[model samples]
Every structure is written in C-alpha cells, then in structure tokens.
Target chain A: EVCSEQAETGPCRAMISRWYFDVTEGKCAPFFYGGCGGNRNNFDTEEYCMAVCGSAI
Target chain B: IVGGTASVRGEWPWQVTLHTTSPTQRHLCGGSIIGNQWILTAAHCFYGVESPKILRVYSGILNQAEIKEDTSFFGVQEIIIHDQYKMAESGYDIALLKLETTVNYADSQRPISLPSKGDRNVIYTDCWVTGWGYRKLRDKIQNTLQKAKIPLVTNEECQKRYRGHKITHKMICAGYREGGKDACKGDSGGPLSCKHNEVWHLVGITSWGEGCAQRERPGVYTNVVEYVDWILEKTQA
Candidate 1:
C-alpha cells in the first residue's frame, strides 16, 4: 500500500511520468515490480513510466 | 555501432586500453576499437580510473597478459561518455574515446567488426563472450582475459529475468540460466560477437549484471540496435 506519506510528487511525479513513457514504448519488462503511476513501489511505477516514455526516461 | 559482447578469454581482439589511475583502479571498465579514430567504452571507467593528464590508450594487445607485457600506450585526445550516463542508476553507461593518434591495423591488432543498420535480430543465434571483469562479485579482477560461450537470448527471456529492472529494447541479455561464465566488474564495454551470414558481427556491449557470475543470472549488455541512430548521429556530428 502506498503510504499517504510517500505519495509521489515533484520529481516523483515526473519519475512516474517517465515510467508511463516506458510502458507506452513497449519497453517495460514484465519482471518489473514497480507498480504503475500512483500505485505501490513508487520507484517501480517511475521505472515503468520511463520504459514507456523511451528517451524521456 | 558494435554489440554482441560476452565475458571470455581475450575475446575482444581490438585495440582497447584502460588507463587505471593511481588510487581508484577499476578493473572492468573497458572500451572497443571501432575505427582507427574511435574507441568505445563505458562512462563509468572515468569515475576514478582517469585523470586529464594521465589518460592513455593502447593498441595491438591480445589479452590482459599481453596488455601487461607489450601494450603500446598513447595519450587520450578526447573522452566522450554518453550524455545520459548518470551515476545514480547506471542507466546509460556507455562512452567513446578518441585516441590522440590513429591505430594502424596490423597482424596482431585489428578493428572489431560493427553491425550496420537494421540488424537487431542478429542476437537470435549463439555467440562468443569475452572480458576481464571479476570472476564473481566481491572478487579481485581476473589476471587474464576470461572467455565464455553464451547463446543470444530473446527479449522475452531477458524481460522475464530483469522484471524488476525493466529491461528495454535498449538492452539485451545472454548466458545460461543454470549459471555459466558471464560479464563481471572489469568487462564493461567488451564486445559480444555473432557470426552473421558468415561474417562475425558485434551485437552488444557489456553494460551491467545482477551479480557477477551468479546462478540463474546472466550478463546484461547494451542493445546496439536501439542506439544505432544515436551513435551515428553523435559520431557523425
């Protein structure tokens, strides 16, 4: 569960947006544990976003 | 750009030189001889290995042993690691070195074969791997060039393996799941070569790994396919 205290913001938000890019680019790996945006594992969420976003990551 | 790298015994036969400065001598950060004018390597090599005045390059060295004995060293004219190489996460760890002098190909030294445009699937076959990285994590650098044979794995397999890390089209994986010789600390920028249509072509560069020589963990390499455009654009510019 995303602790309310850990809610992504600022760079975290951009990080999540980057993960979104990775997903859209078809680069996100299934083994990745990071959840999607606003989900658990904020880092994974951003990792996922970067893959979808390609160079934007 | 060149690719298809593995951790093997003097597998990369090009003129590659690593200048490990005094205190911070990193073993595995290596480079590739793409042309007479260019040497490709990982950006992390410079973390502590180089200083402006102390940088050097070598040509016509076979293995680490040969490098220790008869390597010809030259001053580095320019060192260009990828702009995206960020130390925080090890994302774009690749770089290039321009030697102050051009290396003329000889019997012992030669330029590595490079993959041209539109050959991403070249990794579907078996290939040779070479490096001088650590034999295993937390171990000293191998005294000699290490060699291993690894089959090119599909993107799906790598995706499954690096699920948490998010493997991308910009990356590739090799080695056996049961555990075999693979890239370690000192093997960065080494070449993974495959014989395509009878000519050996490099398909990957040693990038990263979970743990050096670990069970069920293969070596990760930079996907030359994804960076072809960037490589061409940068080198040409």
Candidate 2:
C-alpha cells in the first residue's frame, strides 16, 4: 500500500518527507525514502518536495 | 582570469602589413607595436632593403575582411637598426621602424604595455609568445596568429641545456621541458610577453631558435627590459 502507484505521483509523493503526525509533533519523520536524485543532504525539512513533485512540477 | 602566456596571440591589438606585390612574397618576420608611430622588429627582417619603400606597415588588422582589401599603407619613414647588430654574433638582433603616420587607438587597435626597468625582477614569473610562425618544422607560416604560454628557464638552466652555446644575460629562454611546442623561424621579431599587475607587457623580442620545439631546446629572445632606456633615449632623441 505504501508503494501504491497513486503515492508515486508528484503531489502525493510531495508529502513523503513528512507525515501530518510528524509535523504536529514538531519533528521530522526519520529514514528518508532516498528515491530522489541529486544531493539529498539539504532536504532535512518535511516541507521540502521530493522526486515526483520535482519532476512533475 | 585568462592570464598567462596564452594571452600573447591575436589577442594583441597591433599588427603590421607587408606590401609585397611581387611574385616572391616578403614574409612577415614578426613585429610588435610599441608606440603610436613605432614598431619593434628584428633588424634581419629589414636586411638588404637599401631603401624604406620596400616595406609598408598596416595596423589594426583584426579580421579577414581588412586583410583581403589591403587597406591603408603607412610608409616606412625610418628604420632604426641597432648599432651593434652583427649577423655573425647576433648582437643587437632587434630594430625599430618609425611610421610616417601615427596609429590612432581604436576598439580593435591599441599599444601593448612596455616593461619597465624594475620589471625584470618578476619577468620570469610569467611569460608568453605569439606568432604566425610554423607550428612544426617544414610547415608553412600560419595564416592566423597563435599564442602559447611558456615558462622562463633560468640562465643557469639555459646554459646546462645548451652546453656548447653561450647564453648571455641579453637573452631569455622560454618553453616547456616536456617539449613539442615553441616559437620558430617565422616567429623572429615577435613579442615575448609577461604579465604584471594584471596588464600584459612586452618583455622580449623573438631572436633565435635551436630547432622546432625540441626537448630542452627553448627559444632565445632579446630581453626588452634591457633595452627600454636605450629605446626611450633614442626615440625621444
């Protein structure tokens, strides 16, 4: 279910960096998916968009 | 910064046109514009020309269009051959030509910076050569000017490299140890440049070569720094 095709879409995957629960808890979700290219070191914050969001729009 | 010896090529703004209309072409033996009305080249380039009409100078040659048209010709009014010039000893191999008219500096034409007396201290730190000379032995002169950055080998290094020859202080050696690149025959009288304070200065004139870019065989040039005062004295006189 976590790897569903709908989840692979841009906007859906855009929130991959943070869950609403993690945001409300004032912390980031650990263990990044590492699916995106380029240097991912700067993408510490959940608000940052991932690969699908980057590629689509 | 685009600094170093490579800056000596067509990047230099000054050029002289040869007015050889005969079947036997009088080649460009290389020259550098030092002033609005003066150019410095090798005395050998003008050798056997009893009169000044044999050659003419055309500055501001930046493109092929100007070359094909054979634009204005500045008559050679005076040739200041070095007093001590000797074909045998190669003494004072350089000469200066005074143009009948002065060149007005424009976007495509400008004078190169001249080396000062004290500039000798930093001369070896940066140096370059440019010419229409051949890229290799037995090759024809290049239609377009080419430039190359070369390291200045010390007097001691020059002596060690050319054991049989006398490498005097009047000359400077420049080229790579790895070989396969250097100034050659057609490069005679061309400029050997040095960079200082971000401005390129004419520091030497191409004089002679042992062979075409041979290993350990660097081109010898007339040290322009040694002749600045003499040049000024004569030009002003």
Candidate 3:
C-alpha cells in the first residue's frame, strides 16, 4: 500500500483521498493518493474497500 | 514562451476546459470535443470521485478570462471513465464526458475528427498539442490557450528514454529529443491532433509525463485510436 506524494511543482496536484482496506486494522482508512503513484490498495469508495478487504469501513 | 504561444481564436475549436465546482469553479483538466455532446479526456481527471454534478465543461473560447459570445458552458450529465484505469499504471488513461445538451458548433466550436480504425498505427510527422495548461512545469495555468508543435516519437524510442515505466501500445509519445515543448498541468486530457491530408485527426489524449518538456522525457498520451470502439459505444449510448 505505497502512495507517492504530490509533485512539488507542476500545473497542480489533482490527487484525492481514497479508502483502502487495512488488513491489520480490519477496516478501511482514507489516504491521499496521486494519479501517478498508487497501488491496488486504493479503492474509490468505502464499500469497495470494505468488500475487498472483508472488513468494516 | 517556454515552448508555447497564444493560440488564435478558432485555431483549435475542439479544445475544451474541464472545471470542478467545490464552492467555486476551478479548472481541472483539458479535453477534446469528439461529438456534439461527447468530450474525450484522461481518466485520471476524475479518479476516486463520484457525483458528476460537480463537473462543468466550457467550450468555444480561446481565453478563459475573456468569455466571448461564442463561448458556452455545459453541465456534465455523466462521466464515463475507463474501468481498468489504474493511477499506479500507465495504460488505460482515457475517459469521456457527456454534456447536458448538444453543443452548438459555430466558427469557434467544432468537433475534431477521430482517426479511422485502420489508421490507428499510422504515425504522422506533423502533430500539435493545445491546452490552457501551465506554461511551465511549476507555473500557473495560462489564461489563453497555447499550442505547440511536436513530432511523434516511436514507442521504442520513448521507452528507451523512460526506462522502468510501461510504454504500452495504448500510449503514444510526442516531443523532441532536445526537449523544449510539451504539455504541463491543467493540460491533462487535451487533444494531440495530427495533420493528415489537410485535416487534423485526434491521435492522442494528454495523459502524463515525467516532467514538462525535459530532455529524454517526451509527453505521453492515451492512444485515441486504440479506444475508438469504446468511445463510439459509449458516446452513441
């Protein structure tokens, strides 16, 4: 669940916070992710995060 | 001008600006008018976002500050992002916007033609990219539209420059080896059109790049031809 930080300088940072299923926590947590650096750990919705992780949001 | 100049009115009629409403209107990305009510753009522009009502589309204007009589704004009725698109990956970076109403094409408003399915692999030497994106990597978005002519580079050549990154067939590279001209922020989803037989065909949609106009780092775009069928199926729906 690696997420890259926004570029220091560019047109603008368009990244948004997304929910990811946390295995250890057994729940979904929100984190800011950018367009260029994110993994499958991210989910668009909390339900998606919970469904994939089999945990509560 | 780092690598762009002010685009003349009607120079790129299909160029459209995508804006988001979060208390106030803010420019989000650039797009191309593919049909009266359909716009082509990059999928990353709307990732992890719901509710299309927050998006708006503006067309038929060269300068954002100077809204001419020909300029028109439309609410986003729906947004269709590629299902397989991954922010962590390089491919599948295309999306489409459905306008609430059909745009009225005038001297400053028209849809750009798409490449034929057979012509998808055909690369042109003369192509141009247009947008109101930042003039430089760390600059503010331009008020007036900008245009820059860039040569299409082969995938192999581009891959060599950008090692470790996937340069899939669904992507196209365009820029110079010297690295002086390219698209920057606010330019995502803009059109990269190539001239063919006196007509400009939409070849790519601005997606991502390592940096703006840097040496060995050409601008990458979503290959428009590869998604022609999907675009047709979605827009015609």
Candidate 4:
C-alpha cells in the first residue's frame, strides 16, 4: 500500500518537500506534499521512505 | 588503521586504497579487490562525489608515497552505490566500483574471496581490518598500509551499545571491548576478512562507528553476506 502509490498533493496549503517511492526508474523521488491529505507513501526523507517501501533496492 | 601495526608490502593482496583527484589530495577510504573490474567499498566514501573520474585506486602497495601517476593507480569507471544505502543511516552502506581497466592478478594483488554461493549465515569471529586510516583520533592518517586483528561483535551486543540506532542484520560489529584497537576515520570501506578452511573470505566493509576506538564503541560494517544476492544481481558477469 505504501510502495506503489503516486505522489499526492492533498487539499491543504502547507508547502513542504517530501519524498515518495518513485524511482529515477523505481527508486525514491522528491515531490512536495501538502502535509495533511497526502497518501501513505509520503516521507520526510528518502532514507525513511526507503525504509518503508524500498523495492529491488 | 588504528590499533594495528603496518603490514608488509602486499601482505594483504586484496587491499585497495582510494584516493581523490589531485585537488584535495587525500586518501579517502580503503577498498578490496572483488573482481578484475570491480572494487568493493563503503558508499559513504563517495559522499558528495558525483563523478567516477575524480577517484583513483591503488592496490598491492604498502607505502602511500610510492604511488605514481599512471603506474600505480587505476581509474574508476563507475561508482555503484547500493540503492538501499542511506548516507545518514548506517544500514546498507556498500558500493562497488567498476575499474577503468581490468586488474592484473599477481601474487601481490588479487581479488578477495567472497562467501560461497548461497551462504546465508554470516557469522565469524577472527578477522582483520586493513587500511591507511588515522592511527588515532585527530592524528594524521597513516603513510603506510595499516592492519588490525579484531574479533567480530555480535548484533545483540552492538544493539545494546547503540540503543537509539537500529543495528540491522545487514550490519556487522567489530572491535575490542576495552577498545584499544579499531578501524579509525581513514579506514572506512576496508575489508573485515576471516579465514576459514584456509581461505580468506570478505565478511564486511567498514561502515561507521561512534568515535575512533572508544570503549564499548566498536566499528560497524556492512555485512557482505546479507547482500550476496544483491551483489550477484549487480555483478552478473
């Protein structure tokens, strides 16, 4: 559930840099999240995101 | 490089030294010859380094000063850090370097033995860590290749020592309890090798530690056994 979701911008006005489980092909990637309504794939760091949904890594 | 004495010339045939380009003029870390075209080291060694061309490698050489431009050094063609590796976290801190040219295997220079295929249980005690790192904290790095004979610390004890951080199975703890000997600042990415059945197999790569050989603060390494499958996948050749 946390690995394969697209980056969610959510419905809030919070501006923050977040990492999602999007690879350069399948690795972690940077995408802004709206803090409140984003999906489970959002993470504060690629390291912690890697901890959550790392595939073939 | 701390705690152990200097090794004889080519004593550790698989020992490899990593150096930056002429600019900073530093020996960044140590590595091991894993294949004719591949060298294994820690991913953090290339921290902030973007290109492979900026790094140079030397093997089978004891003295750092004897390294000449083209004769003793080999160029790095590629830097393959483990995708799971996080520079800030100690887990999964491994990398492979593809050399510009194939290494010529000689009595003085050869690839270190890796764990046998499908060997899952990564447990061993007697091992050695070698490099050109600093002998003491805040001291100058070694001019000669240095080595230390230390026992491998178990994960349970290591976890207790570092309660806040998680020491996963992917990591190996090594050093002394009293902490007189260890792999210091300059020795990162060197090999923790163990001899069984008269063959030396690479067990781990020097990754991190609290400080240089402090009591109860043993050096941490990336366990090679945990990533044998990943290694085989990346080095299909």
Candidate 5:
C-alpha cells in the first residue's frame, strides 16, 4: 500500500494501484490508492472491490 | 433519507448534494454547508478519488431532478480529508470540500450552526436527518429531499447493541429501538441535526450503520461536537 510504512519513503511513496468501487458506474475501477486513511470501499482487485461496494443493481 | 417524508423547499438549508461524474455515470452523496466556501462530508465518499475538479455541489433546493432558479452548483476547489481518517475504522470519517466560489447564503442556502465546545453533553432528544438517499434497502434514490425525525440513542445503549464494532466517543447513534427509520445509501455525509433551546445545531454527520432501519442497529454518525475545534481551525484557514 502506498500509505504503508514500507513505502513511506520508497518508490511507491504515497501511491499504490487499488480499485475503488464507483457507486454510479456500478463497477470497480483502478485508481491510485492513498493506501491508508481510507475505508472498506477500497480493494486490491476490481472483482473484490465490486463485490464489496458495488451497487445492488 | 430512509423512512422520511418529502421535505419542503428550504426546510433544511444546510443540506447539499455532492455529485461526481465519470464518463459513464454520475454518483450522488449528501453533505452540509458549514461555511461560505466549505462543505463537510464523509471521507469515504471520496476515497481513492483523483481530484476535486470532477466534484460538484448543489445547494438551495429540495428536488434533485427539478433545479430551481435559485439553485446553484459550485465546483470543488479543494478536498481535505482528516489526516487520521482510516477507511477501515469507524472513527475520524469526516472530510471538508472547498468550493471554487463562496456560497451566497439565503433562506434556502445557508450554513448550519455547529455545537459550541461547551455543548459537549449529547442531547438525547428529537433530531432530524435529511438526504436524498434511498428510502429503503435496494430502493432507488429519492428525487426530492426527505426528512425524518429520529431520536438520539444514548452511547451506552448503542455500544451494548453494537458490541462487535468499536463505537468510539467520536461517534453517535440515532434511531428507534424498533427500527423502521434510518439513513441509507446516498445519504452518507449528510447532517444529523438537533434543536436545543430553539436553536438548531449540527450534532452529527451521517456516517455508517449495519443496514438501514434494522433492529438493534441505529444509524451511526460522526459526532460533530467532538471536532468543533478542528472544524473551526480548518474553516478559518
């Protein structure tokens, strides 16, 4: 995770590829995850993220 | 906005809708006007988001579908989520959005009053939660704003029921023991206001819950009084 201590001053720094469930899109899309200080709405993959935050539709 | 009745225009002036659009769709979340140029909402609402340029705020209207002449849409100039806010946790779930232009306060567009530092005693009285969120689980979001009167649940009682989760001092719970009334999807980040001594106070910001109006699961909100100082510091700057 970008916000993790392992990447605090490393190449990842403050950026990591994570999937955010788009409420409107009804699907998960990849975004630069801030790693920490976010919520359960984030996931490591599109499938998992969608399964968690995807719309009922 | 679950278990709520249609609200009249200007009923809850501080209520605002935060809209974000992608190339394929548009998403809506609720928020409150705390300052002329600042809005307070949930950090999770914008988690993993790139920029504020795509965020727009709509105020001064009850109906989302029918925009009135007085209604205004403001672009987001900045987005500031609480530094300690963690999506995995239940506390520190607040965020502030700076509008590109200062909002013109009016009867239908105004900022809600915050509880004073001394007002630490949680008012276990009747309060209102307003939003355009779904009226029920799996239901569609409302076109017009909805308002529901929910009674504040004491933290002790709330903690007992939600023992599995960490119900911190920064959080408050509201709803009935029998359920059937609570905020749902799309209502995230809206206001949970209470009237004390004839003055309305923004006591809470709608945060999370197990499910809408479920028994033993009152709606959880970010306690506003706990962060009054932080709010002042951020808004003043």
Candidate 6:
C-alpha cells in the first residue's frame, strides 16, 4: 500500500517530513510532504518504507 | 536573473533550487551542495520565512517541472542562518543547511569544490552563476535554470559603485559594467563559481543587488573563502 507513487505535497504550505518509494530511482527517498491530501505512497520512516518497497535490485 | 542562457541538464552539478512545499511548489532561491549532508545558501533567502522547514532542496535538476517527484528532491534537517546577518545589503548574508539524507553523488550530482582560505578573487578569470536567471521584470520567473558568465569586480571598484555601502573583504561582487548581464532576483543563494583545473570552486554565494542588472549595482555575494573556518566549524559537527 505504500510503495509506488512519487513524492507529493498537498496544496497547503505546512511542512511535514515523509518518505516515499521513488519508483524511477527504485529506492525510498525522503521528502517533505505538505500537511494534508498526499497519496498512499507516503511513509513515516525510511525503514518502514523500505520494508514495503525495497525488493527492487 | 537576466542576460543568462538556459543551462544543460547536469551542467552545474552542485546547483540546487529551494522550493516551497505548497502544491504550487514555487521556486524560492538557489543554493549549492557543499558536502554530502550540507548546502550553502544566502541567509537573506529566509528573511520573513525564517522557518526553512517549508524548503525542499532540488539537486542536479535543470527543469523545475520535469523531474519525477522523488528523483532529485531532498529533505532538510536544519537551516542555520548566520547570526550576524540582518539584511541583504549589510552583507553577512550566508547560511548553511543540513540535509536529512546524504546526497548520493551519482554522475549528475557532486559537491562543489571550495576555494582555499587564502584564495583571492582577482587571481581567477573564469566565473559564472547558475540559477533561475534570465527573466524579464514584471513577469513570472521561468522554470528552467539559467547560467551567466560574469566577471568579478575588485573591492575598490565595487565600493565606488555603491559609494556609501561598505564593500568589505568578506563580500565579493560580480557582473559586467554594462547593465546587460547579471544574476536575477531568484538567483539569490546561488553559486558564483570559478573554474580551476577543470573543476568548479565555490567563490561566492549570491546575496544582493539594488536592482536586476543595474549598471553600478552589481550582484554581491558572501565570499566563501572568507568564511572557510565558519563553514568547517559548522559542518564538522
């Protein structure tokens, strides 16, 4: 559920640290997601994001 | 940021742009990657938006709208504004940022080399600034990054240009005598880089100008060479 979309920031300006699987880079990358309205690919930590999306080689 | 041409992809590897996190993701300022986990930029970039948490640093990116969302962006862990810096004209306008993750330094991205503590601006000939320059007044800034070839102005001439304003050793100015070429407004916090032995050394950080490309009001940058100790001190920890 958390490994396919690219990074997203909602319309608002509030910054919140979030991690997401970089489908093109084939790795989980850290980015700041806006406070609300981002997609399913966002994760709270790198370790957890990798657990779901790290199988790529 | 006028009189500059569009830069090729990956041409200025250390060049980075600061963007707000709002969905519009407007470009805020320019910056340079100085180390694996650090970035060098102008302190004035955060003037009213003191909380830099809203900034997202994009490395090795040329077109602002083309990148895959996660490909080139990095999260910021901390934004360290210079303690003495008050406004752009007063000239302590430098800042450093700590990234949440180390930059990969892959083919298209690398840290810019820094000049030695004693390096002088006069000795160097080839210098340029890369950022979102090349825009006209009364128009919105374009997304593509731009590069301008500018020459450094000696302290004597710079002081003469801005008669009352103090142009100290700690600061450096670059631009042509004519008003045709210069670093644009959004180009603040970008690099005033000079080349040596085929490698680019960061000589200055774009700080201020009275107006875009004005004859006497050339762009001023915080001299990186003057603050080597400060940079090392902050980044070491």
If scored against the real structure, what TM-score would every candidate get?
A: 0.69, 0.71, 0.81, 0.77, 0.80, 0.76
The 10 consecutive residues of candidate 6 chain B with the worst lDDT sum are B133-142
List runs of model 2 lying over 4 Å from the truth. Answer: A1-57, B1-10, B15-25, B62-66, B120-123
TM-score for model 3? 0.81
Cα RMSD to the true fold for all candidates: 12.1, 24.6, 6.0, 11.9, 8.2, 13.3
DockQ winner between 4 and 5, please give it: 5
Q: State in Å the error of residue B29, model 5.
A: 1.0
Q: What is the TM-score of chain B in candidate 2?
A: 0.87
Report lDDT (Cα) of residue B16, candidate 4.
85
lDDT of model 1, residue B184: 62
Error of 3 at A2 (Å): 9.1
> How many pairs in model 5 have backbone atoms within 3 A of each other, for residues 3 or more apart or on separate chains, i.e. clashes?
2
Q: What is the C-alpha DockQ of each candidate?
A: 0.02, 0.00, 0.18, 0.02, 0.07, 0.02
lDDT of each: 0.55, 0.59, 0.77, 0.77, 0.75, 0.76
How do all the candidates rank in terms of TM-score, highest first? Answer: 3, 5, 4, 6, 2, 1
- Expressed as tens digits, the lDDT of each residue in B146-194 for candidate 3 is 9999999999999898886889888898899999998877788889989
- Tell me how far the alpha carbon of residue B193 in candidate 2 is from the true structure, in angstroms, after superposition: 1.3
- Give me the displacement of residue B191 in model 1, in angstroms: 1.2
State which candidate, 4 or 5, has the greater lDDT: 4
Task: Write the residue-wise lDDT of candidate 4 on A1-41 in tens digits.
Answer: 78888887442211235689974467788764422345888
Clashing pairs in 6: B1-B134, B1-B184, B1-B185
Docking class of 5: incorrect
TM-score of chain B of each: 0.83, 0.87, 0.94, 0.94, 0.94, 0.93
For candidate 1, lDDT tens digit of each residue in B1-237? 112233343345673646543333233355677777777766555553334455656555445555542446756777776778664123565667777877777655567777777655553475766655556554444545566777777768877876566666767788777765676655667777667877766677776666655556667777765666666666674
